[PDB]
Amino acid sequence: NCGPPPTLSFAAPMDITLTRFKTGTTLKYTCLPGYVRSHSTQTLTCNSDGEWVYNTFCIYKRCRHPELRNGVEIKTDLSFGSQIEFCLIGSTTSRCEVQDRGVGWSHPLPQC
């Protein structure tokens, strides 16, 4: 018998609120805002040994590509939670964040 499911950073339960669980229980999960389904199923399963089996079935959504006239350093990537460093009027940085059923940049481009 399984205990509470682990806390995933990319998904939350889809039809239950957060106890113990019978073997063979299959909880359906949904990708958190800012993530997209990367596997055909999105489930956590209680195995015969009382543990939860699952892989990573969501991945970061990616913002669109950021040109600054008279002046953009992508330090990592364009994925959810990443930051770009912007010549000097405006913001010096922008982050990929959740923006209305999708992702987007926190601030638009600055004025050089």
Binding site: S38, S40, D77
Partner: protein
């Protein structure tokens, strides 16, 4: 002589920088192509799952249609 050493040291540090800027752009281009390939391969597999589901749907509606048609026939037969 002292100026030449100072010039070489400056440009060596300059070339060391530009080598890192390219190396970081190279890895960023490599990771951006692997990530495309990740989705492209997942989609090719996911369409297979889509097709198996559509086949199930076609079979389901077929079994359902044959069931109501047989039920209507027996009810019409009983009425005769």
């Amino acid at each position: 002589e002292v100026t030449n050493e100072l010039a070489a040291s400056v440009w060596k540090k300059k070339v060391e920088e530009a080598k890192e800027k390219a190396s970081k752009l190279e890895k960023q281009l490599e990771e951006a192509q692997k990530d495309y390939s990740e989705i492209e391969g997942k989609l090719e597999q996911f369409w297979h799952d889509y097709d198996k589901l559509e086949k199930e749907n076609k079979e389901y509606a077929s079994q359902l249609g044959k069931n109501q048609e047989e039920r209507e026939k027996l009810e019409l037969e009983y009425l005769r």
